[PDB]
Design a protein around this ligand. Sequence first.
Ligand SMILES: NC(=O)c1ccc[n+]([C@@H]2O[C@H](COP(=O)([O-])OP(=O)(O)OC[C@H]3O[C@@H](n4cnc5c(N)ncnc54)[C@H](OP(=O)(O)O)[C@@H]3O)[C@@H](O)[C@H]2O)c1
Ligand SMILES: Nc1ccc(CNC(=O)c2ccc(Cl)cc2OCC(=O)O)c(F)c1
Length: 314
Amino acid sequence: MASRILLNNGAKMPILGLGTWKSPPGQVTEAVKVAIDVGYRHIDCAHVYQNENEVGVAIQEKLREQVVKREELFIVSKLWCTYHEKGLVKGACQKTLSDLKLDYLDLYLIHWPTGFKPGKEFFPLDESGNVVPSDTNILDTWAAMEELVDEGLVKAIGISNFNHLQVEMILNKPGLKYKPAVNQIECHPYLTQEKLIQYCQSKGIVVTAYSPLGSPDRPWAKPEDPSLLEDPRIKAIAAKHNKTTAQVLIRFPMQRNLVVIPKSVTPERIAENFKVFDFELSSQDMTTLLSYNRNWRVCALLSCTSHKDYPFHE
Ligand SMILES: NC(=O)c1ccc[n+]([C@@H]2O[C@H](COP(=O)([O-])OP(=O)(O)OC[C@H]3O[C@@H](n4cnc5c(N)ncnc54)[C@H](OP(=O)(O)O)[C@@H]3O)[C@@H](O)[C@H]2O)c1
Ligand SMILES: Nc1ccc(CNC(=O)c2ccc(Cl)cc2OCC(=O)O)c(F)c1
């Protein structure tokens, strides 16, 4: 299987990338350096993760060392919810560029379809704990994203956590100039996403699977929760293939024509997670993994559920 997938902007995107949510700022520079040294060419970033400066130090050092050329890297970041206003989008993108020490992003995503009140707080709350919305709709935010392409700041734009009706809203936008290249959504054997993936792929939108290992370090983890890495059924498939459970969980979305972005700051695991191009899951393996769906989400947030554009009511 090829290492990159063709996007609808004409560029190629590596199907395996390194995630950086929760990667501590004192560890993520070495994580990204190791990742690039062992073959990763795609890093998934976001302003809200608060570690883009440190990710950028690694990228810049590997460019300076000539381990890789800039054109060989595929760097992704995301517009946070408090920057959905027309007059804030360019500055948000430029801050991310400055932190990552880049002149352009390969892909810039609307992180969530929900706009929040601008300000210093990433989750502005009213006194009862509800997030305070912005009245800026996803279509105007999309037009602002299109401007970034036309100013040379980003090569591609896309969306994240958009449900099928929200994707449709963008695709049906009056005067749409650029289609979204990517929809980045949660996807793993407990949230298999058949309907949304089919829809996006049918429209030429590439899907990126996040939390492919079930995000065991998510901060709201109840150890009551189901655990992909510990599921004996998935462990059995891994054993059959002489691979780790994580390697099976990463190969699974690859064989669905998805991009996948496992996170690690552990050098041994960063390398392990990349060694997934030399085995194949059978169709029976794939269908068996799909059968484990239970519509379980890592990423949901109670404080935002009354937002008009909350994506997971549908
Ligand atoms: N667009 C969005 O809204 C959104 C939401 C969630 C995530 N994402 C992106 O997707 C990325 C991945 O998702 P995620 O961070 O939620 O979780 P994940 O990649 O599913 O899981 C990360 C966890 O798995 C551990 N791990 C990694 N490789 C392992 C291995 N080979 N064996 C055992 N454990 C392993 C990591 O530990 P160590 O790091 O300690 O090794 C970490 O605790 C994020 O970092 C972010 O870039 C995007
Ligand atoms: N509208 C909205 C916004 C955020 C979430 C869930 N995400 C988080 O709670 C979250 C908060 C801070 C950070 Cl740094 C990361 C988070 O999740 C991962 C992500 O959103 O990429 C959500 F479920 C809905």
